Design a protein around this ligand. Structure first.
Ligand SMILES: [Mg+2]
Ligand SMILES: [Zn+2]
Ligand SMILES: [Zn+2]
Ligand SMILES: [Zn+2]
Lengths: 93, 103, 49, 100, 56, 144
RNA sequence: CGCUUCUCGGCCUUUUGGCUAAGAUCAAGUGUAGUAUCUGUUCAUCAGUUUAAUAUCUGA
RNA sequence: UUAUGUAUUUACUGACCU
């Protein structure tokens, strides 16, 4: 044997996990990803509810996963129909 | 198949925003269907923020119709020269303009 | 005598440092100064005729 | 069953013939379709127990092994005092799977 | 015509006789080979579609 | 054919229930008799709405759940939150390592405390009588 | 009062440091019956149809 | 701003299934 040039591994490793634990970790990882991206975007309308789903709060729209929320940033422009609420906020420009 | 719907395009935009450019296995590690080859292929083929994916000009069309006569195939050699550069946006231009020069 | 930060593709160091700009990080990451020699034309139609 | 909503029961008068369940479905209740608390034997009609159809599974129509039962929750709701619970039609499952 | 697609699939399926094969790339390569087997006319129309109109 | 809420409200011995739709029934007098019979409960409020009975619970964020007190006096919430918080720090390396070399006795609380909490310390909750049907707000009208 | 320099604080990249061959590799799911939710998408006066009430047809 | 019709993913249900 090449004890030097064999593909190494460490003792007591426990091994690489099955598909269920791997893609559960993928969903938690992707949750942390989308949370930090909306934190960098400083979005004040992202809400996560009592069961791990996502809501456009001005929109009042539900979203199963992360890319269902952050692909709801383009349609149904209440995002600029808050110009009416800004006109109620201030009667001028 | 490589269908590339929107809920993976926007996650790819977030991943390239986080991880980087020459690091694709680490962002194919969160897409459940895609490999890193397909991630490179889309982010340089469709999602690159330098891609001017609309606005067909008039200077680039008179450019390409006697740039795709110099080297008649080869829309990956003349894609950076045109700079429309998606290499099939050029092929869209060339087939549309040879429909409109035929009708 | 000040230095820009590092906008690497692998860092594994202090700050990976993403502003909004400084993403292309080159001229355009590619240029060929005329991008084509014109003799291509003097070949191509020469075969065409 | 409750899972496949298009399965229809026989519902004729229950005779003296005791129902049977296949080896794949032993312990299943027939109506509520669970495993615990079996309380009451199954009596099936004479048309759904004739000749070739004797000792055959109530649900699957496979060869029966053990006797069939209702739950206590089917018993005290008196879902055993309706017709015979012999599932008649085979529809839209274990047919297309046979064609697959 | 089918008699040439069968040759191409044999000449490509020959490259997989050991089976410590890779994560996707060559498993999806032989997945493409056996999908070309189980419907030769689907692949044989895809070849003509690829072969008139795709040049990038 | 459909005599209106005026006369239909005039005929009935209890006119205080006849509504704007009860004229549009197919038998009005018995409908407002059974609507005014003694201990019935009414049709839910959302039979005429457009919102599928609870899709108005959109943007309000609510607390997770209050455990009842006899369960909280077993310490199960503190042990369970502690090991959830300790498990949120683990990587897949140690989540797969302590899948095959498991440390046990993480909770090991006792059996007498749990038996006492369900049997000695059982609390009757605050129930309600059979009329008090549920509508959509119903807990944000706590003003009564 | 104004101007330049110095020092203390209120502070807006700090990731575990470096180098090798990006160190090196990897990453399979079905079929069935049903729902929920995004995105795309569009929304002139009678008469009877219909509906709890409302909203198609026809009428000038 | 409730809402439709659809193209259309994503989630979810039934101890569904060799
Ligand atoms: Mg080692
Ligand atoms: Zn039962
Ligand atoms: Zn029968
Ligand atoms: Zn059976």
């Amino acid at each position: 044997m090449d004890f030097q040039h064999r593909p190494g591994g460490k003792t007591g490793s426990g091994g690489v996990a099955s598909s269920s634990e791997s893609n559960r970790d993928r969903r938690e990882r992707l949750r942390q990803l989308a949370l930090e991206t909306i934190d960098i975007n400083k979005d004040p309308y992202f809400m996560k509810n009592h069961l791990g789903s996502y809501e456009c709060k001005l929109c009042l729209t539900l979203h199963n996963n992360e890319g269902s929320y952050l692909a709801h940033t383009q349609g149904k422009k209440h995002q600029t129909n808050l110009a009416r609420r800004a006109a109620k906020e201030a009667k001028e420009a | 198949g490589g269908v590339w719907r929107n809920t993976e395009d926007e996650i790819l935009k977030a991943a390239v925003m986080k991880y980087g450019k020459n690091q694709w296995s680490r962002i194919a590690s969160l897409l459940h269907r895609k490999s890193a080859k397909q991630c490179k292929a889309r982010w340089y083929e469709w999602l690159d923020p330098s891609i001017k994916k609309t606005e067909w000009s008039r200077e680039e069309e008179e450019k390409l119709l006697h740039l795709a006569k110099l080297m008649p195939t080869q829309w990956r050699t003349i894609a950076p020269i045109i700079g429309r550069t998606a290499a099939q946006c050029l092929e869209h231009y060339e087939f549309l303009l040879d429909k409109a020069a035929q009708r | 005598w000040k230095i820009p930060p590092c906008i690497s593709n692998w860092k594994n160091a202090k700050g990976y440092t993403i502003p909004l700009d400084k993403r292309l990080a080159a001229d355009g990451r590619g240029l060929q100064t005329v991008h084509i020699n014109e003799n291509f034309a003097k070949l191509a139609e020469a075969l065409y005729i | 069953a409750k899972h496949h909503p298009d399965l229809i029961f026989c519902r004729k008068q229950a005779g003296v013939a005791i129902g049977r369940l296949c080896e794949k479905c032993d312990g299943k209740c027939v109506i509520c379709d669970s495993y615990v608390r079996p309380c009451t034997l199954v009596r099936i009609c004479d048309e759904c127990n004739y000749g070739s159809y004797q000792g055959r599974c109530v649900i699957c129509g496979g060869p029966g092994v053990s006797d069939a039962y209702y739950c206590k929750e089917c018993t005290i709701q008196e879902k055993d005092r309706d017709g015979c619970p012999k599932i008649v039609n085979l529809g839209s499952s274990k047919t297309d799977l046979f064609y697959e | 015509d089918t008699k040439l697609l069968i040759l191409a699939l044999e000449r490509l399926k020959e490259a997989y006789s050991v089976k410590s094969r890779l994560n996707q790339s060559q498993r999806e390569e032989l997945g493409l080979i056996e999908q070309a087997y189980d419907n030769p006319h689907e692949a044989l129309s895809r070849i003509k579609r690829h072969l008139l109109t795709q040049r990038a | 054919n459909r005599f209106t809420v005026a006369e239909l409200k005039q005929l009935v011995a209890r006119p205080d229930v006849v509504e704007m739709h009860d004229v549009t029934a197919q038998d009005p007098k018995l409908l407002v008799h059974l609507k005014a019979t003694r201990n019935s409960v009414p049709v839910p409020r959302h039979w005429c709405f457009k919102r599928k009975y609870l899709q108005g619970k959109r943007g309000i964020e609510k607390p997770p759940f209050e455990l009842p007190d006899f369960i909280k006096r077993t310490g199960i919430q503190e042990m369970r939150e502690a090991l959830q918080e300790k498990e949120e720090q683990k990587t897949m390396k140690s989540k797969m390592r302590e899948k095959v070399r498991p440390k046990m006795g993480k909770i090991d609380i006792d059996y007498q405390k749990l038996h006492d909490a369900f049997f000695k310390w059982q609390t009757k909750p605050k129930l309600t009588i059979h009329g008090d049907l549920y509508y959509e707000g119903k807990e944000f009208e706590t003003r009564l």
